[PDB]
Amino acid sequence: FQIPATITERYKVGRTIGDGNFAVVKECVERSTAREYALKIIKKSKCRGKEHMIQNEVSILRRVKHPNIVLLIEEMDVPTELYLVMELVKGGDLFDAITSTNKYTERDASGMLYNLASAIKYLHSLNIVHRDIKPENLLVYEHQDGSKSLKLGDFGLATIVDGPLYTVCGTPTYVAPEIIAETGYGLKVDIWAAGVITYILLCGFPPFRGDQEVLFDQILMGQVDFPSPYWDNVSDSAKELITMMLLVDVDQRFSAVQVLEHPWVNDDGLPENEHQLSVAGKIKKHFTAAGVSVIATTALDKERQVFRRRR
């Protein structure tokens, strides 16, 4: 690679930290601030013919400015490659946020859902559906006081909603019923995905586990079980919230605003903060490279995964 002068003048590019079929990722310290970023390099020879799937992801990253999102810091376009200076978040993903957390409680989970719901609210205000909201795409941003904030990344499946979408995209565990049914879907699939995550946050296992076709039936029926004894000492406010996020009826289902306005998220006193949640055990049973992985992927790496038995 012949890194342009524009980049090498204001950034010291280092070792390759990640690779992909369509992107290379290097260390990238901003010379003026000594702040560490990631330099994502895409060879335009691979993206030819499908410029739109790369260009549509970038034009979204260029717009979205929110603290709870992995941000595009800078773009440098040359005839042979596209350079993207990206935020490099090193606090691990969501599963690490739960494990590393000593004294893990409902208040921590509520705090993460606040960051997530806030990010989703921002995207939905711009009529952007992320469609790939999952624990692997939720990176942990650690502050100086020890507190943590989540940042949603990987906009490889993100798109502007102008009407109902029909492409069957996303990870089966987190995919909404309307995506599976192919009846048309929109923004609120992100809420469904967030509800699955919230469910996992409290107990460490998915609400819908199902064989593959059984999983899809579980999702389609949307009967959330809060089994004992795992949900015995979880607040009903939390279980109520998850119920509203995983409604098959899209109109009844909460919007991002309605999640944030829910007492368990809105009122920062409701979440239990003295009785712990023993979730660490279940996570391993069922489920800084985390930061690089989110950047190394592109839209062109995305594939369909959900396949019902044809009716």
Coordinates of all heavy atoms in Angstrom, one line a residue, residues 223-310:
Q223 N -43.7 -16.1 22.3 CA -44.0 -16.4 23.7 C -42.8 -16.4 24.6 O -42.1 -17.4 24.6 CB -44.8 -17.6 23.9 CG -46.3 -17.4 24.0 CD -46.7 -16.6 25.2 OE1 -47.7 -15.8 25.2 NE2 -46.0 -16.7 26.3
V224 N -42.5 -15.3 25.3 CA -41.3 -15.2 26.1 C -41.5 -15.9 27.4 O -42.4 -15.5 28.2 CB -40.8 -13.8 26.3 CG1 -39.6 -13.7 27.1 CG2 -40.6 -13.1 25.0
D225 N -40.7 -16.9 27.7 CA -40.7 -17.5 29.0 C -39.6 -17.0 29.9 O -38.5 -16.8 29.5 CB -40.6 -19.0 28.9 CG -40.6 -19.8 30.2 OD1 -41.5 -19.5 31.0 OD2 -39.8 -20.7 30.4
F226 N -40.0 -16.7 31.2 CA -39.0 -16.3 32.2 C -38.8 -17.4 33.2 O -39.4 -17.4 34.3 CB -39.4 -15.0 32.9 CG -39.7 -13.9 31.9 CD1 -40.9 -13.4 31.6 CD2 -38.6 -13.2 31.3 CE1 -41.1 -12.4 30.7 CE2 -38.8 -12.2 30.4 CZ -40.1 -11.8 30.1
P227 N -38.1 -18.5 32.8 CA -38.0 -19.7 33.6 C -37.4 -19.5 35.0 O -36.6 -18.6 35.3 CB -37.1 -20.6 32.8 CG -36.3 -19.7 32.0 CD -37.2 -18.5 31.7
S228 N -37.8 -20.4 35.9 CA -37.3 -20.5 37.3 C -36.0 -21.4 37.3 O -35.9 -22.3 36.6 CB -38.3 -20.9 38.3 OG -39.3 -19.9 38.4
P229 N -35.1 -21.1 38.3 CA -35.1 -20.0 39.3 C -34.4 -18.8 38.8 O -34.2 -17.8 39.6 CB -34.4 -20.6 40.5 CG -33.5 -21.7 39.9 CD -33.9 -21.9 38.4
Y230 N -34.0 -18.7 37.5 CA -33.2 -17.7 37.0 C -33.8 -16.3 37.0 O -33.1 -15.3 37.2 CB -32.7 -18.1 35.6 CG -32.3 -19.5 35.4 CD1 -33.1 -20.4 34.8 CD2 -31.1 -19.9 35.9 CE1 -32.7 -21.7 34.6 CE2 -30.7 -21.2 35.8 CZ -31.5 -22.1 35.1 OH -31.1 -23.4 35.0
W231 N -35.1 -16.3 36.8 CA -35.9 -15.0 36.7 C -36.7 -14.8 38.0 O -37.6 -13.9 38.0 CB -36.8 -15.0 35.5 CG -36.0 -15.0 34.2 CD1 -35.5 -16.0 33.6 CD2 -35.8 -13.8 33.4 NE1 -34.9 -15.6 32.4 CE2 -35.0 -14.3 32.3 CE3 -36.0 -12.5 33.6 CZ2 -34.6 -13.4 31.3 CZ3 -35.6 -11.6 32.6 CH2 -34.9 -12.0 31.5
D232 N -36.4 -15.5 39.1 CA -37.2 -15.3 40.3 C -36.8 -14.0 41.0 O -37.7 -13.3 41.5 CB -36.8 -16.5 41.3 CG -37.3 -17.8 40.8 OD1 -37.9 -17.9 39.7 OD2 -37.1 -18.8 41.5
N233 N -35.6 -13.6 41.0 CA -35.1 -12.4 41.6 C -34.8 -11.3 40.6 O -33.8 -10.5 40.8 CB -33.9 -12.7 42.5 CG -34.3 -13.6 43.6 OD1 -35.3 -13.6 44.2 ND2 -33.4 -14.6 43.9
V234 N -35.5 -11.3 39.5 CA -35.4 -10.3 38.5 C -36.7 -9.4 38.6 O -37.8 -10.0 38.7 CB -35.2 -10.8 37.1 CG1 -35.3 -9.7 36.0 CG2 -33.9 -11.6 37.0
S235 N -36.5 -8.1 38.5 CA -37.7 -7.2 38.6 C -38.7 -7.4 37.5 O -38.4 -7.7 36.4 CB -37.2 -5.7 38.6 OG -36.6 -5.4 37.3
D236 N -40.0 -7.3 37.9 CA -41.1 -7.5 37.0 C -41.1 -6.4 36.0 O -41.6 -6.5 34.9 CB -42.4 -7.5 37.7 CG -42.6 -8.7 38.7 OD1 -41.8 -9.6 38.6 OD2 -43.5 -8.7 39.6
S237 N -40.6 -5.2 36.4 CA -40.4 -4.1 35.5 C -39.6 -4.4 34.3 O -39.8 -4.0 33.2 CB -39.9 -2.9 36.2 OG -39.9 -1.7 35.4
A238 N -38.5 -5.2 34.6 CA -37.6 -5.6 33.5 C -38.2 -6.6 32.6 O -38.2 -6.5 31.4 CB -36.3 -6.2 34.1
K239 N -38.9 -7.6 33.2 CA -39.6 -8.7 32.5 C -40.7 -8.1 31.6 O -41.0 -8.5 30.5 CB -40.1 -9.7 33.4 CG -39.0 -10.6 33.9 CD -39.6 -11.7 34.9 CE -40.1 -11.0 36.2 NZ -40.2 -12.0 37.3
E240 N -41.4 -7.0 32.2 CA -42.4 -6.3 31.4 C -41.9 -5.6 30.2 O -42.5 -5.6 29.1 CB -43.1 -5.4 32.4 CG -44.1 -4.4 31.7 CD -44.7 -3.4 32.6 OE1 -44.8 -3.7 33.8 OE2 -45.0 -2.2 32.2
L241 N -40.7 -5.0 30.4 CA -40.1 -4.3 29.3 C -39.7 -5.2 28.2 O -40.0 -4.9 27.0 CB -38.8 -3.5 29.9 CG -37.9 -2.8 28.8 CD1 -38.7 -1.9 27.9 CD2 -36.8 -2.1 29.5
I242 N -39.1 -6.3 28.5 CA -38.7 -7.3 27.6 C -39.9 -7.9 26.8 O -39.8 -8.1 25.6 CB -37.9 -8.5 28.2 CG1 -36.6 -8.0 28.8 CG2 -37.6 -9.6 27.2 CD1 -35.9 -9.0 29.7
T243 N -41.0 -8.0 27.5 CA -42.2 -8.5 26.9 C -42.7 -7.5 25.8 O -43.1 -7.9 24.7 CB -43.3 -8.7 27.9 OG1 -43.0 -9.6 28.9 CG2 -44.6 -9.1 27.2
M244 N -42.6 -6.2 26.1 CA -43.0 -5.2 25.1 C -42.1 -5.1 23.9 O -42.4 -4.6 22.9 CB -43.1 -3.8 25.8 CG -44.2 -3.8 26.9 SD -45.9 -4.1 26.2 CE -46.3 -5.6 26.9
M245 N -40.8 -5.5 24.1 CA -39.8 -5.4 23.0 C -39.9 -6.6 22.1 O -39.4 -6.5 21.0 CB -38.4 -5.2 23.7 CG -38.2 -3.9 24.4 SD -36.5 -3.7 25.1 CE -36.3 -5.1 26.2
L246 N -40.4 -7.7 22.6 CA -40.5 -8.9 21.8 C -41.9 -9.3 21.5 O -42.3 -10.4 21.5 CB -39.9 -10.1 22.6 CG -38.4 -9.9 23.0 CD1 -37.9 -11.0 23.8 CD2 -37.5 -9.7 21.7
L247 N -42.7 -8.2 21.1 CA -44.1 -8.5 20.6 C -44.1 -8.7 19.1 O -43.5 -7.9 18.4 CB -45.0 -7.3 21.0 CG -45.4 -7.1 22.5 CD1 -46.2 -5.9 22.6 CD2 -46.1 -8.3 23.0
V248 N -44.8 -9.8 18.7 CA -44.9 -10.1 17.3 C -45.6 -9.0 16.6 O -45.3 -8.6 15.4 CB -45.6 -11.4 17.1 CG1 -45.8 -11.7 15.6 CG2 -44.8 -12.6 17.7
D249 N -46.7 -8.4 17.2 CA -47.4 -7.3 16.7 C -46.5 -6.1 16.7 O -46.1 -5.5 17.8 CB -48.6 -7.0 17.5 CG -49.6 -6.0 16.9 OD1 -49.2 -4.8 16.9 OD2 -50.6 -6.4 16.4
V250 N -46.1 -5.6 15.5 CA -45.1 -4.6 15.4 C -45.5 -3.2 16.0 O -44.8 -2.5 16.5 CB -44.7 -4.4 13.9 CG1 -43.7 -3.2 13.7 CG2 -44.1 -5.7 13.3
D251 N -46.8 -3.0 15.8 CA -47.4 -1.7 16.3 C -47.5 -1.7 17.9 O -47.2 -0.7 18.5 CB -48.8 -1.5 15.8 CG -48.8 -1.2 14.3 OD1 -47.7 -0.6 13.8 OD2 -49.8 -1.5 13.6
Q252 N -47.8 -2.8 18.5 CA -47.8 -3.0 19.9 C -46.4 -2.9 20.5 O -46.2 -2.5 21.6 CB -48.5 -4.3 20.3 CG -50.0 -4.3 20.1 CD -50.7 -3.3 21.1 OE1 -50.4 -3.4 22.3 NE2 -51.6 -2.5 20.6
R253 N -45.4 -3.4 19.7 CA -44.0 -3.5 20.1 C -43.5 -2.1 20.3 O -43.9 -1.1 19.7 CB -43.2 -4.2 19.0 CG -41.7 -4.4 19.4 CD -40.9 -5.0 18.3 NE -41.6 -6.1 17.6 CZ -41.3 -6.6 16.4 NH1 -40.4 -6.0 15.7 NH2 -42.0 -7.6 16.0
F254 N -42.7 -1.9 21.4 CA -42.1 -0.6 21.7 C -41.2 -0.1 20.6 O -40.6 -0.8 19.9 CB -41.3 -0.7 23.0 CG -42.1 -0.6 24.3 CD1 -43.5 -0.5 24.3 CD2 -41.4 -0.6 25.5 CE1 -44.2 -0.3 25.4 CE2 -42.2 -0.5 26.7 CZ -43.5 -0.3 26.6
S255 N -41.2 1.3 20.5 CA -40.3 2.0 19.7 C -39.1 2.2 20.6 O -39.1 1.9 21.8 CB -40.8 3.3 19.2 OG -41.2 4.1 20.2
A256 N -38.0 2.8 20.0 CA -36.8 3.1 20.8 C -37.1 4.1 21.9 O -36.6 4.0 23.0 CB -35.7 3.7 19.9
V257 N -38.0 5.1 21.6 CA -38.4 6.1 22.5 C -39.2 5.4 23.7 O -38.9 5.7 24.9 CB -39.3 7.1 21.9 CG1 -39.9 8.1 22.9 CG2 -38.6 7.9 20.8
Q258 N -40.1 4.5 23.4 CA -40.9 3.8 24.4 C -40.1 2.9 25.3 O -40.5 2.6 26.4 CB -42.0 3.1 23.7 CG -43.1 4.0 23.1 CD -44.1 3.2 22.3 OE1 -43.9 2.1 21.8 NE2 -45.3 3.8 22.2
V259 N -38.9 2.4 24.8 CA -38.0 1.6 25.6 C -37.3 2.6 26.6 O -37.2 2.2 27.8 CB -37.0 0.9 24.7 CG1 -35.9 0.3 25.6 CG2 -37.6 -0.2 23.9
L260 N -36.9 3.7 26.1 CA -36.1 4.7 26.9 C -37.1 5.3 28.0 O -36.6 5.7 29.1 CB -35.5 5.8 26.1 CG -34.3 5.3 25.3 CD1 -34.0 6.3 24.1 CD2 -33.1 5.2 26.2
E261 N -38.3 5.4 27.6 CA -39.3 6.0 28.5 C -39.8 5.0 29.5 O -40.6 5.4 30.4 CB -40.5 6.6 27.7 CG -40.1 7.9 27.0 CD -41.3 8.5 26.3 OE1 -42.4 7.9 26.2 OE2 -41.2 9.7 25.9
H262 N -39.4 3.8 29.4 CA -39.9 2.7 30.3 C -39.2 2.9 31.7 O -37.9 3.0 31.7 CB -39.7 1.3 29.8 CG -40.3 0.2 30.6 ND1 -39.7 -0.3 31.7 CD2 -41.5 -0.4 30.4 CE1 -40.4 -1.2 32.2 NE2 -41.5 -1.3 31.5
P263 N -39.9 2.8 32.8 CA -39.4 3.0 34.1 C -38.0 2.3 34.4 O -37.2 2.9 35.1 CB -40.5 2.5 35.1 CG -41.7 2.3 34.2 CD -41.4 2.8 32.9
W264 N -37.9 1.1 34.0 CA -36.7 0.3 34.2 C -35.5 0.9 33.6 O -34.4 0.6 34.0 CB -36.9 -1.2 33.7 CG -35.8 -2.1 34.2 CD1 -35.7 -2.6 35.5 CD2 -34.7 -2.6 33.5 NE1 -34.6 -3.5 35.6 CE2 -34.0 -3.5 34.4 CE3 -34.3 -2.5 32.2 CZ2 -32.9 -4.1 33.9 CZ3 -33.2 -3.1 31.8 CH2 -32.4 -4.0 32.6
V265 N -35.7 1.7 32.5 CA -34.6 2.3 31.8 C -34.6 3.8 32.2 O -33.5 4.4 32.4 CB -34.7 2.2 30.3 CG1 -33.6 2.9 29.6 CG2 -34.7 0.7 29.9
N266 N -35.7 4.4 32.2 CA -35.9 5.9 32.5 C -35.5 6.2 33.9 O -34.5 6.9 34.2 CB -37.3 6.3 32.2 CG -37.4 7.8 32.2 OD1 -36.5 8.6 32.6 ND2 -38.5 8.3 31.7
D267 N -36.2 5.6 34.9 CA -35.9 5.8 36.3 C -34.7 5.0 36.7 O -34.8 3.7 36.8 CB -37.1 5.5 37.2 CG -36.9 5.8 38.6 OD1 -36.1 6.6 38.9 OD2 -37.6 5.2 39.5
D268 N -33.6 5.6 37.0 CA -32.4 5.0 37.4 C -32.3 4.6 38.9 O -31.2 4.6 39.5 CB -31.2 5.8 37.0 CG -31.3 7.2 37.5 OD1 -32.4 7.8 37.7 OD2 -30.2 7.8 37.8
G269 N -33.4 4.2 39.4 CA -33.5 3.8 40.8 C -34.2 2.4 40.9 O -34.0 1.7 41.8
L270 N -35.0 2.1 39.9 CA -35.8 0.9 39.8 C -34.9 -0.3 39.7 O -35.1 -1.3 40.4 CB -36.8 0.9 38.6 CG -38.2 1.2 39.0 CD1 -39.0 1.5 37.8 CD2 -38.8 -0.1 39.7
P271 N -33.9 -0.3 38.8 CA -33.0 -1.4 38.7 C -32.3 -1.8 40.0 O -31.6 -1.0 40.6 CB -31.9 -0.9 37.6 CG -32.6 0.1 36.9 CD -33.6 0.8 37.8
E272 N -32.4 -3.1 40.3 CA -31.8 -3.6 41.5 C -30.3 -3.5 41.4 O -29.7 -3.8 40.4 CB -32.1 -5.1 41.7 CG -31.6 -5.8 43.0 CD -32.3 -5.3 44.2 OE1 -33.3 -4.5 44.1 OE2 -31.9 -5.7 45.3
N273 N -29.7 -3.0 42.5 CA -28.2 -2.6 42.5 C -27.5 -3.2 43.8 O -26.3 -2.9 44.0 CB -28.1 -1.1 42.5 CG -26.6 -0.7 42.3 OD1 -26.1 0.0 43.1 ND2 -26.0 -1.1 41.2
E274 N -28.2 -4.1 44.5 CA -27.5 -4.7 45.7 C -27.5 -6.2 45.6 O -26.6 -6.9 46.0 CB -28.2 -4.2 47.0 CG -29.8 -4.2 46.9 CD -30.4 -3.6 48.1 OE1 -29.7 -3.0 48.9 OE2 -31.6 -3.8 48.3
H275 N -28.6 -6.8 45.0 CA -28.6 -8.2 44.7 C -28.0 -8.5 43.3 O -28.5 -7.9 42.4 CB -30.0 -8.8 44.8 CG -30.6 -8.9 46.2 ND1 -29.9 -9.6 47.2 CD2 -31.7 -8.4 46.8 CE1 -30.6 -9.5 48.3 NE2 -31.7 -8.8 48.1
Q276 N -27.0 -9.3 43.3 CA -26.3 -9.6 42.0 C -27.0 -10.5 41.1 O -28.0 -11.2 41.5 CB -24.9 -10.1 42.3 CG -23.9 -9.1 42.8 CD -22.5 -9.6 42.9 OE1 -22.0 -10.2 41.9 NE2 -21.8 -9.4 44.0
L277 N -26.5 -10.6 39.9 CA -27.0 -11.5 38.9 C -25.9 -12.5 38.5 O -24.9 -12.1 37.9 CB -27.5 -10.8 37.6 CG -28.7 -9.8 37.8 CD1 -28.9 -9.0 36.6 CD2 -30.0 -10.7 38.1
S278 N -26.1 -13.8 38.8 CA -25.1 -14.8 38.4 C -25.3 -15.3 37.0 O -25.9 -16.3 36.8 CB -25.2 -16.0 39.4 OG -25.0 -15.5 40.7
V279 N -24.8 -14.5 36.1 CA -25.1 -14.7 34.6 C -23.9 -15.3 33.9 O -24.0 -15.9 32.9 CB -25.5 -13.4 34.0 CG1 -25.7 -13.5 32.5 CG2 -26.8 -12.8 34.6
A280 N -22.7 -15.1 34.5 CA -21.4 -15.4 33.9 C -21.4 -16.9 33.5 O -20.7 -17.2 32.5 CB -20.3 -15.1 34.8
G281 N -22.0 -17.8 34.2 CA -22.0 -19.2 34.0 C -22.7 -19.6 32.7 O -22.2 -20.4 31.9
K282 N -23.9 -19.0 32.5 CA -24.7 -19.3 31.3 C -24.2 -18.8 30.0 O -24.3 -19.4 29.0 CB -26.1 -18.8 31.5 CG -26.8 -19.3 32.8 CD -27.1 -20.8 32.7 CE -27.9 -21.3 33.8 NZ -27.2 -21.1 35.2
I283 N -23.5 -17.6 30.0 CA -22.9 -17.0 28.8 C -22.0 -18.0 28.2 O -22.0 -18.2 26.9 CB -22.2 -15.7 29.2 CG1 -23.2 -14.7 29.7 CG2 -21.5 -15.1 27.9 CD1 -24.2 -14.1 28.7
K284 N -21.0 -18.5 28.9 CA -20.0 -19.4 28.4 C -20.6 -20.7 27.8 O -20.1 -21.2 26.8 CB -19.0 -19.8 29.5 CG -18.5 -18.6 30.3 CD -18.0 -17.4 29.5 CE -17.5 -16.3 30.4 NZ -18.6 -15.8 31.3
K285 N -21.7 -21.1 28.4 CA -22.4 -22.4 28.0 C -23.1 -22.2 26.7 O -23.1 -23.2 25.9 CB -23.4 -22.8 29.1 CG -24.2 -24.0 28.8 CD -25.2 -24.3 29.8 CE -26.1 -25.5 29.4 NZ -27.2 -25.7 30.4
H286 N -23.5 -21.0 26.4 CA -24.4 -20.8 25.2 C -23.7 -20.0 24.1 O -23.9 -20.3 22.9 CB -25.7 -20.1 25.6 CG -26.6 -20.9 26.4 ND1 -27.1 -20.6 27.7 CD2 -27.2 -22.1 26.1 CE1 -27.9 -21.5 28.1 NE2 -28.0 -22.4 27.2
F287 N -22.9 -19.0 24.4 CA -22.2 -18.2 23.5 C -20.7 -18.4 23.5 O -20.2 -19.5 23.4 CB -22.5 -16.7 23.8 CG -24.0 -16.4 23.9 CD1 -24.6 -16.3 25.2 CD2 -24.8 -16.2 22.8 CE1 -25.9 -16.0 25.3 CE2 -26.2 -16.0 22.9 CZ -26.7 -15.9 24.2
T288 N -8.2 -7.1 22.7 CA -8.9 -6.0 22.0 C -9.3 -6.3 20.6 O -9.5 -5.4 19.8 CB -8.1 -4.7 22.1 OG1 -7.2 -4.7 21.0 CG2 -7.3 -4.6 23.4
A289 N -9.3 -7.6 20.2 CA -9.6 -8.0 18.9 C -11.1 -7.8 18.6 O -11.5 -7.8 17.4 CB -9.2 -9.5 18.7
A290 N -11.9 -7.6 19.6 CA -13.3 -7.4 19.4 C -13.5 -6.1 18.7 O -14.4 -6.0 17.8 CB -14.0 -7.3 20.8
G291 N -12.7 -5.1 19.0 CA -12.8 -3.8 18.4 C -12.4 -3.8 16.9 O -13.0 -3.2 16.0
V292 N -11.4 -4.6 16.6 CA -10.9 -4.7 15.2 C -11.8 -5.5 14.4 O -12.0 -5.2 13.2 CB -9.5 -5.4 15.2 CG1 -9.0 -5.5 13.8 CG2 -8.5 -4.5 16.0
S293 N -12.5 -6.5 15.0 CA -13.4 -7.4 14.2 C -14.5 -6.7 13.6 O -15.0 -7.0 12.5 CB -13.9 -8.6 15.1 OG -14.7 -9.5 14.4
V294 N -15.0 -5.7 14.4 CA -16.2 -4.9 13.9 C -15.8 -4.0 12.7 O -16.6 -3.7 11.9 CB -16.7 -4.0 15.1 CG1 -17.8 -3.1 14.6 CG2 -17.3 -4.9 16.2
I295 N -14.5 -3.6 12.7 CA -14.0 -2.7 11.6 C -13.6 -3.5 10.4 O -13.7 -3.1 9.3 CB -12.9 -1.9 12.1 CG1 -13.3 -1.1 13.4 CG2 -12.4 -0.9 11.1 CD1 -14.5 -0.2 13.3
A296 N -13.0 -4.7 10.6 CA -12.5 -5.5 9.5 C -13.6 -6.0 8.6 O -13.3 -6.2 7.4 CB -11.8 -6.7 10.1
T297 N -14.8 -6.1 9.1 CA -15.9 -6.6 8.2 C -16.5 -5.4 7.4 O -16.4 -4.2 7.8 CB -17.1 -7.2 9.1 OG1 -18.1 -7.7 8.2 CG2 -17.7 -6.1 10.0
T298 N -17.1 -5.8 6.3 CA -17.7 -4.8 5.4 C -19.1 -5.3 5.0 O -19.6 -6.4 5.5 CB -16.9 -4.6 4.1 OG1 -17.0 -5.7 3.3 CG2 -15.5 -4.2 4.4
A299 N -19.9 -4.5 4.2 CA -21.2 -4.9 3.7 C -21.0 -6.2 2.8 O -21.9 -7.0 2.8 CB -21.8 -3.8 3.0
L300 N -19.9 -6.3 2.1 CA -19.7 -7.4 1.2 C -19.4 -8.7 1.9 O -19.4 -9.7 1.2 CB -18.5 -7.0 0.2 CG -18.8 -5.8 -0.7 CD1 -17.5 -5.5 -1.5 CD2 -20.0 -5.9 -1.5
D301 N -19.2 -8.7 3.2 CA -19.0 -9.9 4.0 C -20.3 -10.5 4.5 O -20.3 -11.6 5.0 CB -18.0 -9.6 5.1 CG -16.7 -9.1 4.7 OD1 -15.8 -9.9 4.3 OD2 -16.4 -7.9 4.8
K302 N -21.4 -9.8 4.3 CA -22.6 -10.2 4.9 C -23.3 -11.2 4.0 O -23.3 -11.2 2.7 CB -23.6 -9.0 5.0 CG -23.0 -7.9 5.9 CD -22.8 -8.4 7.3 CE -22.1 -7.3 8.2 NZ -21.8 -7.8 9.5
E303 N -23.9 -12.2 4.6 CA -24.6 -13.3 3.9 C -25.9 -13.7 4.6 O -26.0 -13.4 5.9 CB -23.7 -14.5 3.8 CG -22.4 -14.3 3.1 CD -21.5 -15.6 3.1 OE1 -21.8 -16.5 3.9 OE2 -20.6 -15.6 2.3
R304 N -26.9 -14.2 3.9 CA -28.1 -14.7 4.5 C -27.8 -16.0 5.3 O -26.9 -16.8 4.9 CB -29.1 -15.0 3.4 CG -30.4 -15.7 3.9 CD -31.4 -15.8 2.8 NE -32.6 -16.6 3.3 CZ -33.7 -16.7 2.6 NH1 -33.8 -16.2 1.4 NH2 -34.7 -17.4 3.1
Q305 N -28.5 -16.2 6.4 CA -28.3 -17.3 7.3 C -29.6 -18.0 7.7 O -29.5 -19.2 8.0 CB -27.6 -16.8 8.6 CG -26.3 -16.0 8.4 CD -25.8 -15.4 9.6 OE1 -25.8 -16.0 10.7 NE2 -25.3 -14.1 9.5
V306 N -30.7 -17.3 7.5 CA -32.0 -17.9 7.9 C -32.6 -18.6 6.7 O -32.8 -17.9 5.6 CB -32.9 -16.7 8.4 CG1 -34.3 -17.3 8.7 CG2 -32.4 -16.1 9.7
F307 N -32.9 -19.8 6.9 CA -33.6 -20.6 5.8 C -34.7 -21.5 6.4 O -34.4 -22.6 6.8 CB -32.5 -21.5 5.1 CG -31.5 -20.7 4.4 CD1 -30.2 -20.5 5.0 CD2 -31.7 -20.1 3.1 CE1 -29.3 -19.8 4.3 CE2 -30.8 -19.4 2.5 CZ -29.5 -19.2 3.1
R308 N -35.9 -21.1 6.3 CA -37.0 -21.9 6.7 C -37.2 -23.1 5.8 O -36.7 -23.1 4.6 CB -38.4 -21.1 6.7 CG -38.6 -20.2 7.8 CD -39.9 -19.5 7.7 NE -41.0 -20.2 8.4 CZ -42.3 -19.9 8.3 NH1 -42.7 -18.9 7.6 NH2 -43.2 -20.6 8.9
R309 N -37.8 -24.2 6.3 CA -38.3 -25.3 5.4 C -39.3 -24.7 4.5 O -40.3 -24.1 5.0 CB -38.8 -26.4 6.2 CG -37.9 -27.0 7.2 CD -38.5 -28.1 8.1 NE -38.8 -29.3 7.4 CZ -40.0 -29.6 6.8 NH1 -41.0 -28.8 6.9 NH2 -40.1 -30.8 6.2
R310 N -39.2 -24.7 3.2 CA -40.1 -24.1 2.3 C -41.5 -24.7 2.4 O -41.7 -25.9 2.4 CB -39.6 -24.2 0.8 CG -39.7 -25.6 0.2 CD -39.2 -25.6 -1.2 NE -40.1 -24.8 -2.1 CZ -39.9 -24.7 -3.4 NH1 -38.9 -25.3 -4.0 NH2 -40.7 -24.0 -4.2

